[PDB]
Amino acid sequence: GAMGSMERASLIQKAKLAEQAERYEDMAAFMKGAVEKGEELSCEERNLLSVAYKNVVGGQRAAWRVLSSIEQKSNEEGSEEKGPEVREYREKVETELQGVCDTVLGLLDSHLIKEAGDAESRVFYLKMKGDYYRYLAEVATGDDKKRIIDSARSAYQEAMDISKKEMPPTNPIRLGLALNFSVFHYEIANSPEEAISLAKTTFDEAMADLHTLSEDSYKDSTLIMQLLRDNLTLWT
């Protein structure tokens, strides 16, 4: 749409400016423009895309949880009836959140996943697909809830099978997928045991593979193993 007249290299350049300015909504729109040029994204470009949307939907999720919490409070025994406003404003944020998740998923589906033949790009896009369905599951409430949770699990699982076949245990994408799938098990799929087992074996297999690594072109991997450990500490 709006980015159709801008050069692909000018979109990538502006997305990096928007990142430095913490302007994530502009960053997401530049990267959506760039995707819509129809060429594959490089490793660096993939990172720009995922960071931009993670941040946009991250602020929506934080706002949704403040509002949903207010809303649940107003439904407790002896809470004063405040009218329709809290539900209305919660639904507004929620529908804006859902439209951003639908936009990311439409980008994955047209045509990032289908054209992704290397493991690192394929796994990366399937992880994103799992995360965005997960964000949708967090707010899902009606009939769709089961199906959304399953689209998340199904995307994460396909990314896991490929990452296990094609990537070393310390690969940062392989590690971040396991971190996130493991959170899915805990917070969405009601499977705290599967969550804990996945983070543990993930952490342990990556430990045993550190010796093969240069010291350090693997700061992202170090950071993620730490988040696996922090999750394990919260959960056990």
């Binding site: 995360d131 971040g176 971190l179 996130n180 959170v183 917070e187 988040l227 919260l234």
Partner: peptide, 5 residues
């Protein structure tokens, strides 16, 4: 809230 990446 647990960490994700």
């Amino acid at each position: 809230f647990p960490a994700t990446v």
